[PDB]
Write a protein that binds this ligand. Structure first.
Ligand SMILES: *[C@@H]1O[C@H](CO)[C@@H](O)[C@H](O)[C@H]1NC(C)=O
Ligand SMILES: *[C@@H]1O[C@H](CO)[C@@H](O)[C@H](O)[C@H]1NC(C)=O
Ligand SMILES: *[C@@H]1O[C@H](CO)[C@@H](O)[C@H](O)[C@H]1NC(C)=O
Lengths: 593, 201
């Protein structure tokens, strides 16, 4: 019978897969912690063998017909295996698409804008132009850097994106999807028992529904940021207009977190930095990860493995080998969980250690699942369950409990307001950018935006949704979205929006589980086993169940809710309402200086 | 009575090479004095679960034959070496009867059975048509016919090779590291019992 054949096929696949996936992950780890040519080529052959095996098994798995499979775990495993992806095209089209992707990656990584009249002062984005976007206050220098990277990237990436859209549309329509946007929205599709059914076409309206009520908080934050930037830039920003695109602290305006020195509520009150306390008490990276482990065992989740301490790198090695600076949590398979992070003794690395160990705990919990179901419930869950640990680790209660912050520390309202504003610049400010970018990409892939009217549409929506105006008029020979890393390198972007919603939903559910009686931003889930069990019910699932069921297992709801997000930012929202009485909340679509 | 002719428990527990669980090694032990002192003394044991007899009174109650079955499995599968259990090892590699009188001993063997390149010398049976009877071995390498079409000796779709390798590596998690298992089965027959522990005076 077909179901028993599928069961034996999956048994043969899990055994072969786990081994090849472990070899690929171990080779990737050996390259990432030891950069050389031989490790790179070993990683190349290991990934080649694993990918060839995966496509070979996926072609055989497509022979099974799902109409006669009754058990939903086998059906979900076969659904996961039958996703061909980019292999649905012919070899010529797949090779052309890979060529376009590789040339986009190597032209984004080697993007170059150079000083006019000063030809020796040529600046790359990664070492020097990001410093100009993050720190510089001069209007003309930021206008230079923004317009120059827009020109020397958009002009070179517009035709590449023109055939990239067509090839991705062909790949998606070869996989029974309407467009490439529907292919990306298929990550949120959940087929399961009654009431847990989620559809791709539902997701857009859900996102729009969740953007219907984040909009007043974003409008008040935008008005406050606009007034403070008007204080910084006297005549270049209008009171009733949108913000200029190059004054937002990042290259693209994705995060507003670099506007915090310019937009600080109370400059006299310092931040909650405890780096000097770590320096005085002689903390090192081992103690940072031990404190994170103490937090995760206090909440009820299991201890770190001995292989975690033995095999991970938690420090710059400094013995002659090059490493990647980015922190990454690795689930190699066969019970091997590692963290690659060059941990310096700072508060940010302390929170990052909590975040990556949250990723490792999420990976450890679903190890009991079969190999194809050892993933997150959707793309947002995996990063949300690390962001909640980063949220709880940064509270003054947690810092006073572990001795980093003094026992007699006073939490006045001003430090809560400026902490909430910094969190808002990081978290709330990225939501209209994420929603507008994903909406533009979805409408481009759908064909709702005409091919020759791309740019004119994009700068309308940034004037409408994000409330950010272009500094200079751009015609259709520019490709202004493509200057971002995620869109030039074929990455889904709605995961950050869903991550942001799920993060505060999980945090409110855990704080209600831990019986916290105060404001949500002061909440700590330490020493609460019931919150850990409530979390671990979802963490043990993986993607074995629909993501709506896992979401109901944590928060008791089957969809995205932004009432926890507004509840988190409620003191800040009241403060922003209190200081926007005289000013005008909102923006005007027409270009105001 | 002086004490001599100890049973060769050094040969079973301290062997340099164990066997795969599909071809599990069986050694009969008879006409000697078996002292269980050395086994209890050894600290690394992960499981010393005994069935039908107490571990403390091993040295006084005495038996006719003692069977020592040695093999290597992965840590997660040590729970399957018990009466009444199911899994790949219980159903297809090593089955104990429901009235098993004896002990199961397991310990971690990373320093002896794990290789950085991968130890591909330990095998297990993943596919078999029917479950194993107690104390039965299957060393057959016949291609498992999972469908309706004949395999004709060649693997492929719905035709899998039943013996899969335990690719042990030292960086695996503790549940996946190689574990050496010795199963002591004690039996009494109508013959006079000649496997009896030490005497004191
Ligand atoms: C890094 O890789 C080289 C490649 O041969 C190897 O010789 C060296 O031992 C590796 N370093 C470490 C710390 O493993
Ligand atoms: C959690 O428990 C430990 C146990 O010693 C204690 O020291 C710590 O203060 C507790 N944390 C909180 C927030 O109560
Ligand atoms: C195996 O070797 C160890 C090493 O000293 C020894 O103590 C033990 O008695 C030997 N025999 C058994 C059965 O463990």
């Amino acid at each position: 019978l077909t179901e028993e054949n599928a069961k034996t096929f999956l048994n043969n696949f899990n055994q072969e897969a786990e081994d090849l996936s472990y070899q690929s992950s171990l080779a990737s780890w050996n390259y990432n912690t030891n950069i050389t040519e031989e490790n790179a080529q070993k990683m190349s052959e290991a990934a080649a063998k694993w990918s060839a095996f995966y496509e070979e098994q996926s072609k055989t798995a497509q022979s099974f017909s799902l109409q006669e499979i009754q058990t939903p775990i086998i059906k979900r495993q076969l659904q996961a295996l039958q996703q061909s992806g980019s292999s649905a095209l012919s070899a010529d089209k797949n090779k052309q698409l890979n060529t376009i992707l590789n040339t986009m990656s190597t032209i984004y990584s080697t993007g170059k804008v150079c000083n006019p009249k000063n030809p020796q002062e040529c600046l790359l984005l990664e070492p020097g132009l990001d410093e100009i976007m993050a720190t510089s206050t001069d209007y003309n220098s930021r206008l230079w850097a923004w317009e120059g990277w827009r020109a020397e990237v958009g002009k070179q990436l517009r035709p590449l994106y023109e055939e990239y859209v067509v090839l991705k549309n062909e790949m998606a329509r070869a996989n029974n999807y309407n467009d490439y946007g529907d292919y990306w929205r298929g990550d949120y599709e959940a087929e399961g028992a009654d009431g847990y059914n989620y559809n791709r076409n539902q997701l857009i309206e859900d996102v729009e529904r969740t953007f219907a009520e984040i909009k007043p908080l974003y409008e008040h934050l935008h008005a406050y940021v606009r007034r403070k930037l008007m204080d910084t830039y006297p005549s270049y920003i209008s009171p009733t207009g949108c913000l200029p695109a190059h004054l937002l602290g990042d290259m693209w305006g994705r995060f507003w977190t670099n506007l915090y020195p310019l937009t600080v509520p109370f400059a006299q009150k310092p931040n909650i930095d405890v780096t000097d306390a770590m320096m005085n008490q002689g903390w090192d990276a081992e103690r940072i990860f031990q404190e994170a482990e103490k937090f995760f065992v206090s909440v009820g989740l299991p201890h770190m493995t001995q292989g975690f301490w033995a095999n991970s790198m938690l420090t710059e090695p400094a013995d002659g080998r090059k490493v990647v600076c980015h922190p990454t949590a690795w689930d190699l398979g066969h019970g091997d969980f590692r963290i690659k992070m060059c941990t310096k003794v700072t508060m940010d690395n302390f929170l990052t250690a909590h975040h990556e160990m949250g990723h490792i705990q999420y990976d450890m919990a679903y190890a009991r699942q079969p190999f194809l179901l050892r993933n997150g419930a959707n793309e947002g869950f995996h990063e949300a369950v690390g962001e909640i640990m980063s949220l709880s680790a940064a509270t003054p209660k947690h810092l006073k409990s572990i001795g980093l912050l003094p026992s007699d520390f006073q939490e006045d309202s001003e430090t809560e307001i400026n902490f909430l504003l910094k969190q808002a610049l990081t978290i709330v400010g990225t939501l209209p950018f994420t929603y507008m970018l994903e909406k533009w990409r979805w409408m481009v892939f759908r064909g709702e935006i005409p091919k020759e009217q791309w740019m004119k549409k994009w700068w309308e929506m940034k004037r409408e949704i994000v409330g950010v105006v272009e500094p200079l008029p751009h015609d259709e020979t520019y490709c202004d979205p493509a200057s971002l890393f995620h869109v030039s390198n074929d990455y889904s972007f709605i995961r950050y929006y869903t991550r942001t919603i799920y993060q505060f939903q999980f945090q409110e559910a855990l704080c209600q589980a831990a019986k916290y009686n105060g404001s949500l931003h002061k909440c700590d889930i330490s020493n609460s086993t019931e919150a850990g069990q409530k979390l671990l019910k979802m963490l043990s699932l993986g993607n074995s169940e629909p993501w709506t069921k896992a979401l109901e297992n944590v928060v008791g709801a089957r969809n995205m809710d932004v009432k926890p997000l507004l509840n988190y930012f409620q003191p800040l929202f009241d403060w922003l309402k209190e200081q926007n009485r005289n000013s005008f909340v909102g923006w005007n679509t027409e270009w105001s200086p | 009575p002086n004490i001599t002719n100890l049973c060769p428990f050094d040969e079973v527990f301290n062997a340099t090479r164990f066997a795969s669980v599909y071809a599990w090694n069986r050694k009969r032990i008879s006409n000697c004095v078996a002292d269980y002192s050395v086994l209890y003394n050894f600290a690394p044991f992960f499981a010393f679960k005994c069935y039908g007899v107490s571990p403390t009174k091993l040295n006084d109650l005495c038996f006719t034959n003692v069977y020592a079955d040695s093999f290597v499995i992965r840590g997660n599968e040590v729970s399957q070496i018990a009466p009444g259990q199911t899994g790949n090892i219980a159903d297809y590699n090593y089955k104990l009867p429901d009235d098993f009188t004896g002990c199961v001993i397991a310990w971690n063997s990373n320093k002896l059975d794990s290789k950085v390149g991968g130890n591909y010398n330990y095998l297990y049976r993943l596919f078999r048509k029917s479950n194993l009877k107690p104390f039965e071995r299957d060393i057959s390498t016949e291609i498992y016919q999972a469908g309706n079409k004949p395999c004709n000796g060649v693997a492929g779709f719905n035709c899998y090779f039943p013996l899969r390798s335990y690719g042990f590596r030292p960086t695996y998690g503790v549940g996946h590291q190689p574990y050496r298992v010795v199963v002591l089965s004690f039996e009494l027959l109508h013959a006079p019992a000649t496997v009896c522990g030490p005497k004191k005076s």
